[PDB]
Design a protein around this ligand. Structure first.
Ligand code: NI
Ligand code: NI
Lengths: 286, 312
């Protein structure tokens, strides 16, 4: 059974899309980025990877082997704090109007990164009774694609596996890894998946995806995985990116996302106006 | 020769107008954030009347019998002035209410709010004693969940209150918007202060209702009502929860889920085969496959499944 598709600039996010996402754990969104923004983010992506090779450092960068013959960077962490177009991407109103419907009005940006890879699994940050807490799709990985992902080389999902118990999840994944539907993507498209959805990929050309994860503040507040202070800082981060993007004249015609969480969840005055967009998870863990 | 003469004289709180707009993104937002949503005009006039008369019938029954079976009474029924205030399992007791429980606008809204694996849980009618009803103290409805706000502050466990009688501002429900996200300390403190004090509506909003209107509230939203007189104020309440939440956190046994799914499908079907509702686009109930359980047990012969018999 196919992965539902939202042509976002054509229809908006329809109830059917929302329902598809909640049931199957995944949703394909076509044409998120305009031609111009796609190129801007492609370029920021290009420069960040180049700088990783030249500056063979592991600062916020995952390497296959130590910068050893055949070593390569495959991931940069906190890319929103590293490139101006990506920070502005983090405040994209179509993306965030979607995240608001799916995660709720108390959404906060958690992980942000860019993966450029050269196993079936769920993503991390699991809770006790994870399916009880977020089988419905409240903790969401936003994959914004800079390069094509053809059926040869794309992520595969097992729909509805976001409601699977631990035992069946583990048993099925072990079978699958020892020995499904594809998200076939064009640049500027967005893949949304529930972190509880079993996904994975099987000999191809380098691909780039920017990942934004989102959680409800009230889930973080009570269950983690971050510390309580973290909520307010990522709220400033979200508000800053929306601000930055709003003040950019190529985006002047966009109606900015109106971030309005419940009163008791507004925590951005709590701290002084932040210096950085980078907040290391290990420094804000519980 | 005949003259052939012709005879003389002769000649030869946000509001959703569900049937007007549909359920909009702003409506879902407002419900998620404030813990409350008014839906105007849920019922046709004809269905409202059918449901009003089923309500009267049930109330009349409670008085006739003074049974404590499925009925909450102010005092023991043998006592002077004792009255009934709530009847349980009204969906089993009255065919127009079972069909109401399959109402496609209601369920499509619930599906957007509670999710695709929604199941119906509590079903009842509440009404007060028009000679005078005591104050409804500020309270949350029972969730039974640890970390309740983490689990459903966003509004996944929901009371749908369908109004048979008007609830004007001088006789209606009040609630504190966004109190569905309050931690236990704030909620407990705030509720205690309000209840030890005289009735006071500041920081609260009223739920002002015409008959056939629908009040959606998050069970974590603090609510209450002032002492009132002169109106019977009947409300039919359907609660809904997600199947995967019940499955893992309760409060019901795992078996309950499949049975209530059967109840839901049964109600949807008889509403479909009802001539009065043929023009309706019937609700298409489609939960995730690993949570379809409505074949796990033999065909249900009833719509009533007593909570204490399916508790975990
Ligand atoms: Ni992953
Ligand atoms: Ni109540």
């Amino acid at each position: 059974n196919r992965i539902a598709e939202c042509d976002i600039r054509r229809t908006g996010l329809l109830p059917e899309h929302v329902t598809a996402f909640r049931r199957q754990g995944v949703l394909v969104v076509r044409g998120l980025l305009t031609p111009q923004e796609l190129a801007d983010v492609q370029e920021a992506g290009r420069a960040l990877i180049d700088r990783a090779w030249s500056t063979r450092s592991m600062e916020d960068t995952v390497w296959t082997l130590e910068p050893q013959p055949g070593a390569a960077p495959v991931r940069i962490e906190y890319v929103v704090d590293k490139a101006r177009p990506i920070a502005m991407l983090a405040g994209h109103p179509l993306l965030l109007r979607i995240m608001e419907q799916l995660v709720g009005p108390n959404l906060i940006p958690t992980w942000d990164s860019m993966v450029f890879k050269t196993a079936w699994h769920r993503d991390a940050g699991l809770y006790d009774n994870a399916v009880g807490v977020t089988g419905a799709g409240r903790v969401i990985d936003a994959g914004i694609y800079l390069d094509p992902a053809p059926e040869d080389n794309c992520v595969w999902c097992i729909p509805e596996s976001n409601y699977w118990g631990d035992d069946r999840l583990t048993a099925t994944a072990d079978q699958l890894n020892a020995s499904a539907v594809p998200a076939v993507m064009q640049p500027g498209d967005l893949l949304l998946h529930n972190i509880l959805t079993l996904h994975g990929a099987p000999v191809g050309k380098q691909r780039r995806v920017i990942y934004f994860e989102y959680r409800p503040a009230e889930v973080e507040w009570q269950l983690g995985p971050h510390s309580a202070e973290y909520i307010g800082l990522k709220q400033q981060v979200l508000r800053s990116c929306i601000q930055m993007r709003a003040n950019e004249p190529q985006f002047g015609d966009e109606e900015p996302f109106d971030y309005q969480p419940a009163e008791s969840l507004r925590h951005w005055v709590d701290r002084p106006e932040i210096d950085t967009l980078r907040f290391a998870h290990e420094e804000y863990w519980r």
